[PDB]
Every structure is written in structure tokens, then in C-alpha cells.
Amino acid sequence: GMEINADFTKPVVIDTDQLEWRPSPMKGVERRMLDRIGGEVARATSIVRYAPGSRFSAHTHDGGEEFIVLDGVFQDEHGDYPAGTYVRNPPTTSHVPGSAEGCTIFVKLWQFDPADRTQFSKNMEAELGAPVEGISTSLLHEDERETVTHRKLEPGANLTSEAAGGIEVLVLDGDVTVNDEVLGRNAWLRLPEGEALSATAGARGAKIWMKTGHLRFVRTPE
Ligand SMILES: O=C(O)c1cccnc1
Ligand SMILES: [Zn+2]
């Protein structure tokens, strides 16, 4: 089937601003696929853009749905999710999505444990703690499998992680140097199990989203 960066032993870095927007099944929703594994129904990581005035029929999240609103405002029957909002919609949940204004989101599908029932949304900046050596951290989500954070890095600040079970990063603002490479806004990085992350912010600092541990639990939708 469609297997995009489906060898989780390989590091990948992507300047996602260079990728073609491709059609999705939803009218007015286009996608930049980042990783994908499985047949008909997919464990998927994508950036997707909803056109202004997007209104759809309901859907259910058979494998869960996690996302960051990158720009604009996403909506459902429970209200607004403005840019900077992080959302977990666990397996078996449902809603009617839309976007009056349009939005762009970073979204993961079918990467929840089937038994997970934790659902919420969070302003990623609102619970940033005190800086520790120029890094402020907001704990977005943590369970026995994964740890999800938002990090704000002052200029020159270094985040070094030796977290187990894989490391995945999306650059939200500014830039970080990783392995001699400058990663700006919308760069996506996935590092295989055992590889340390060392990211140093540039002159304007940086903001990132980060998940660790999840590559131990890669599953094709059953
Ligand atoms: O990953 C995808 O293909 C995707 C995710 C959300 C909405 N449309 C497509
Ligand atoms: Zn949904």
C-alpha cells in the first residue's frame, strides 16, 4: 500500500513548505503527507489545510486523532480551536469538523492505543513553565507510551534529549540547528529509537512541538 517514510529505523527531515499539496477525499481539504503505514486505513502524520468556509459531515475517530492548529481557526460543535491549540480526540470519539476562517493543522491519525479515552484541547503556550537554561516547557500530554511537549527556546538555547523510543519534532516558529542543518518554520524531523536529539535555537529563538516514545508502538490499523 501507500507507505510513506514507513521505515521507522531511518531518520527523516522534511522542509514541508516544499511539498505538493495533494487532494484529500474532503472537498477543500488538501494534504502534505509526512508518514503513512498500512493498507486501506492508515497510521498517518500529515499537514492538512482546510479552505475558508469548510463544512463537513460528521466522522468518528476509529484510531484517534491528534492535532496542532498551526494557523487559522479549526471548529467543531464544541467551539473554536485557534492557532496554537493542541487537541487529542481518542478512539471512538466523533464530531462535525469545519473551519469558517480556514486553517492549517498538523495531524496524526491511528496513533492512539485503542483503549485510550483521554480527550482534551490545550493552549500550548498557556502552561509554559519557567525557563531552564533558556528552554521553557509545557507538558501537553503524557502516558505510559509517549511524552508530548511544546518547547520555547531562547536564542542560542540548546535542548538535548536522550529520550527512549523515538523522537519527532515539528518546528513552529524561528529555527533550530540539528545535525548541522538549520530547521525553520514547518520543518519536520523524525529520529529513530536510540538517536539523541540536540537542537539549538538561532538568533530569533524557536518554538517546537515534540513527541518521544511513540516509535515503540507503531501499528498498522487492524
Ligand atoms: O492524513 C491525512 O491524509 C488527512 C488528515 C486529516 C484530514 N484529511 C486528510
Ligand atoms: Zn476529527
Side-chain angles (χ1 to χ4, degrees), residues 1-54 56-203 205-218 220-221:
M2 281 261 300
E3 279 178 24
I4 303 171
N5 295 310
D7 182 347
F8 293 88
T9 72
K10 306 300 187 183
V12 49
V13 66
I14 308 181
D15 181 351
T16 68
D17 288 340
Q18 289 185 51
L19 303 180
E20 280 304 293
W21 290 109
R22 296 198 183 283
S24 74
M26 309 161 74
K27 167 204 217 296
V29 178
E30 51 202 359
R31 58 183 164 190
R32 287 168 164 165
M33 293 172 283
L34 304 182
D35 66 32
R36 218 179 176 87
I37 74 153
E40 181 186 321
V41 151
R43 179 200 188 275
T45 311
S46 293
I47 293 175
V48 302
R49 176 167 292 160
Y50 288 77
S54 284
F56 306 94
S57 293
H59 64 260
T60 56
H61 309 115
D62 290 340
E65 170 182 282
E66 172 193 24
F67 64 89
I68 313 165
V69 184
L70 301 180
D71 185 72
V73 179
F74 177 75
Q75 304 177 300
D76 65 16
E77 70 276 17
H78 301 282
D80 292 336
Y81 307 81
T85 307
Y86 168 77
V87 180
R88 294 184 70 90
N89 287 332
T92 82
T93 56
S94 64
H95 65 164
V96 183
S99 185
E101 303 199 35
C103 61
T104 307
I105 68 178
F106 170 89
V107 59
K108 288 179 164 290
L109 301 175
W110 277 96
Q111 303 173 43
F112 288 61
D113 186 276
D116 190 347
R117 295 291 180 274
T118 294
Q119 181 169 45
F120 60 89
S121 59
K122 200 171 267 292
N123 175 333
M124 293 186 297
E125 300 223 28
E127 294 80 35
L128 282 164
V132 169
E133 300 184 348
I135 313 296
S136 297
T137 302
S138 179
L139 186 54
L140 303 179
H141 180 70
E142 185 165 69
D143 58 35
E144 63 185 347
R145 299 171 286 283
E146 71 192 61
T147 297
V148 190
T149 52
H150 172 69
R151 311 291 191 139
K152 177 185 174 119
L153 300 77
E154 300 310 304
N158 174 269
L159 178 48
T160 287
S161 176
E162 297 181 297
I167 299 172
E168 184 176 336
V169 172
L170 185 72
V171 183
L172 304 166
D173 204 6
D175 67 85
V176 292
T177 299
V178 176
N179 289 315
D180 291 320
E181 193 165 27
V182 176
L183 304 188
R185 193 171 75 80
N186 300 316
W188 182 74
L189 176 68
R190 193 188 74 206
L191 299 181
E193 301 193 44
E195 187 175 343
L197 171 69
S198 180
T200 309
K207 293 177 191 192
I208 71 173
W209 174 96
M210 172 170 183
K211 182 183 301 198
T212 79
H214 54 306
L215 298 195
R216 302 171 291 188
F217 303 102
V218 173
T220 293

